Design a protein around this ligand. Sequence first.
Ligand SMILES: Cc1[nH]c(-c2ccccc2C(F)(F)F)c2c1C(=O)CCCC2
Ligand SMILES: [Cl-]
Length: 121
Amino acid sequence: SFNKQWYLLANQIIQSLSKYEGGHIFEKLVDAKKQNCPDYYDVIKNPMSFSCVKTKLKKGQYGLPTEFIKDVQLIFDNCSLYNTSGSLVAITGKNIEAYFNNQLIVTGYNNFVTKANTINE
Ligand SMILES: Cc1[nH]c(-c2ccccc2C(F)(F)F)c2c1C(=O)CCCC2
Ligand SMILES: [Cl-]
């Protein structure tokens, strides 16, 4: 059914991000002390990781396909906010962001976004 179909696609997309070269740095929430960034949660007020999104998909927390996108994009927005442009981490976030936006097209996920935006308008 409709929601089952884009839940399955979102699970496939998120797993492809996890397996992207360097994607492991977004898999879990940043450990401020262990990663030597003690000010991280002073800057990032809405943290997000791939495993957070996977948990929301597993538990059924998303009601609209755009909610999945907003969370994944939040990962990359947090990355660009905290990390200086050109740094290793910022470069990796820009790369996976571009990969994610292309996957939303080639999988057809954006088609579910368009349908759902019309249903709930
Ligand atoms: C998105 C993000 N991920 C990681 C991370 C996590 C676990 C292992 C390794 C890393 C790292 F290599 F990227 F640093 C960090 C991070 C930041 O925003 C802060 C800068 C460095 C820490
Ligand atoms: Cl690493």
